[PDB]
């Protein structure tokens, strides 16, 4: 068997928060929601990574990028645009990129450039909208009895938190919210809010982790946000197999809930939350008239209910696995 | 005076064509449509230039990349995509890429984010069938192009059986002058029994053509209207405070620019080159604010412009709500 196609979808960066802690004084080194120096290095070194798997192992992909090798489609956020063409840089890296006369580089150092085609903010192939993404956690989440379940447990510490914070905490999704800054905060070595001890921050945290992974072990959730990117994947495929495409590798730049909704969707949904630079690939083999897919998170394969005990099964099998999915809902 | 603010538009670099003549055997080192390497390098040094204008010599922007300093925009093609990155691989070179004191990329490369609208969009290229639907309906029955159609007709009959490819109006001449134009720009050799004076004759009727086309102002509006209102609005934004922008950067064809000037009542007596680039240019002294227009390195002069190719953003203002009402 030889690997003949891959599709990859990347969570961003470390990025600074949108949201801030009202009673600590954190600046970030960037604007809100930009990707931070730390973020683009992260995705540099998956950039790095991929090359000696599928470029210096596999042999799928040359050492010099070909046109229209790999189609490249990010969310309409600069942390997302920016995650992809830090990753490419590492993919592709300095020295690797074209000439022009007598082998005098076409740009400084020879960077290759890789297009990358953006959504509008509107598509909800990537990231669902803000305010349709809080129309389904309300509607399809937060009175479930799981939340409500965690949120009991959870709800003697609000109080506390938010004399300590000054954020407003009265739920769950406000605890989520903090949670993202302490991760950020803590990735940059930041002092913890007076008052806040070690324990609560951990325990902060945990909540959020828990939280984000909760709203997607619903496959109903995950199919509602996810459906269409994880048919598109496997459409990429089934385009490898039957000539109507060339790409050898299609890349969607997103986010965490990218990854959670199609992992969701395909009924494998994720225990915990993906962290930054998080990634996951469909891989797809030829061995004569035979093919067959594997699915790698972040760095190992997952075993679908369909797969064998390889982790592997037909792209016939794939196919018809996710007809029943779209069926169902 | 100082200069607060830019918005600026870019023509691809060289790029391979579409086309090809039937009657050559054209290889063009990438995949058609797609930006070359040459292309790529033309975007670069552009990118030098204007690192060495609006950084080195105005200061307006500083040596190292401030996130959410340049707003950029580019139409839905690759060529048009990779053009902006190259660009500012050059405006922002390698060496002066974030740190985390070690380099956050490889040689310290500064990403910049870039966006691209849809493929239907109209704001930076006119979709091809919509562009020829206004040609059609605009230019290809003016006077203008009946007269040079009758004067270069006696032609298509020879150039049609030298290049194979149907010559039967303009429309086609300017096809295969695409094709000529970039094998010329690679040094290949012309097409077995085509004269360097018919080659010559064919790329000047294609840069007639494509110039012929925005002479009208109203085809011209039609066409960049938008983008040109757009443009004028970043600068007042940069006034008024609604945007923190110091430059906004649309990346797109020579449809992009021609339809911008022609808009603006200055359309270009030549087609634009490869990596052709156009600026509009802000300045400030204490409550005066005041307008520039530089194309291909050189100021135009606006008919509402004074001596110095200047004027109030005021009376710019003015001047395009008068085009607005006029169309």
């Given at each position: 068997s030889?690997?003949?196609?891959?599709?990859?979808?990347?969570?961003?960066?470390?990025?600074?928060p949108?949201?801030?802690?009202?009673?600590?004084?954190?600046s970030?080194?960037?604007?809100?929601?930009?990707?931070?120096?730390?973020?683009?290095?992260?995705?540099?070194?998956?950039?790095?990574?991929?090359?000696?798997?599928?470029?210096?192992?596999?042999?799928?992909?040359?050492?010099?990028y070909?046109?229209?090798?790999?189609?490249?489609?990010?969310?309409?956020?600069?942390?997302?645009?920016?995650?992809?063409?830090?990753?490419?840089?590492?993919?592709?890296?300095?020295?690797?990129?074209?000439?022009?006369?007598?082998?005098?580089?076409?740009?400084?150092?020879?960077?290759?450039?890789?297009?990358?085609?953006?959504?509008?903010?509107?598509?909800?192939?990537?990231?669902?909208?803000?305010?349709?993404?809080?129309?389904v956690?309300?509607?399809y989440?937060?009175?479930?009895?799981?939340?409500?379940?965690?949120?009991?447990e959870?709800?003697?510490?609000?109080?506390?938190?938010?004399?300590?914070?000054?954020?407003?905490?009265?739920?769950?999704?406000?605890?989520?919210?903090?949670?993202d800054?302490?991760?950020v905060?803590?990735?940059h070595?930041?002092?913890?809010?007076?008052?806040?001890?070690?324990?609560?921050?951990?325990?902060?945290?945990a909540?959020?982790?828990?939280?984000?992974?909760?709203?997607?072990?619903?496959?109903?959730?995950?199919?509602?946000?996810?459906?269409?990117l994880?048919?598109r994947?496997i459409?990429?495929?089934?385009?490898?197999?039957?000539?109507?495409?060339?790409?050898?590798?299609?890349?969607?730049?997103?986010?965490?809930?990218?990854?959670?909704?199609v992992?969701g969707?395909?009924?494998?949904?994720?225990?915990?939350?993906?962290?930054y630079?998080?990634?996951?690939?469909?891989?797809?083999?030829?061995?004569?008239?035979?093919?067959?897919?594997?699915?790698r998170?972040?760095?190992?394969?997952?075993?679908?209910?369909?797969?064998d005990?390889?982790?592997?099964?037909?792209?016939?099998?794939l196919?018809?696995?996710?007809?029943?999915?779209n069926?169902?809902?």
């Open positions: 030889k690997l003949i196609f891959v599709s990859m979808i990347t969570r961003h960066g470390d990025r600074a949108f949201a801030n802690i009202e009673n600590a004084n954190y970030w080194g960037t604007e809100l929601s930009e990707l931070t120096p730390i973020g683009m290095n992260q995705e540099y070194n998956l950039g790095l990574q991929l090359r000696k798997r599928y470029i210096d192992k596999f042999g799928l992909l040359p050492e010099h070909v046109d229209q090798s790999i189609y490249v489609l990010s969310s309409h956020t600069n942390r997302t645009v920016v995650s992809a063409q830090s990753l490419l840089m590492g993919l592709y890296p300095a020295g690797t990129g074209p000439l022009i006369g007598d082998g005098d580089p076409a740009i400084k150092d020879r960077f290759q450039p890789i297009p990358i085609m953006t959504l509008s903010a509107d598509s909800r192939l990537i990231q669902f909208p803000y305010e349709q993404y809080l129309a956690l309300k509607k989440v937060y009175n479930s009895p799981e939340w409500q379940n965690k949120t009991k959870a709800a003697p510490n609000f109080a506390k938190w938010q004399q300590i914070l000054g954020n407003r905490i009265s739920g769950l999704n406000d605890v989520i919210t903090v949670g800054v302490l991760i905060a803590q990735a070595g930041k002092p913890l809010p007076k008052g806040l001890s070690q324990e609560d921050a951990d325990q902060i945290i909540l959020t982790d828990w939280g984000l992974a909760q709203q997607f072990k619903s496959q109903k959730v995950s199919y509602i946000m996810g459906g269409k994880t048919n994947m459409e990429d495929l089934n385009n490898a197999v039957n000539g109507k495409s060339k790409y050898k590798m299609t890349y969607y730049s997103g986010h965490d809930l990218t990854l959670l909704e992992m969707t395909l009924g494998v949904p994720l225990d915990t939350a993906p962290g630079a998080s990634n996951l690939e469909m891989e797809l083999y030829k061995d004569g008239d035979i093919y067959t897919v594997k699915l998170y972040n760095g190992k394969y997952v075993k679908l209910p369909i797969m005990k390889n982790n592997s099964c037909s792209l016939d099998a196919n018809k696995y996710m007809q029943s999915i069926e169902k809902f």
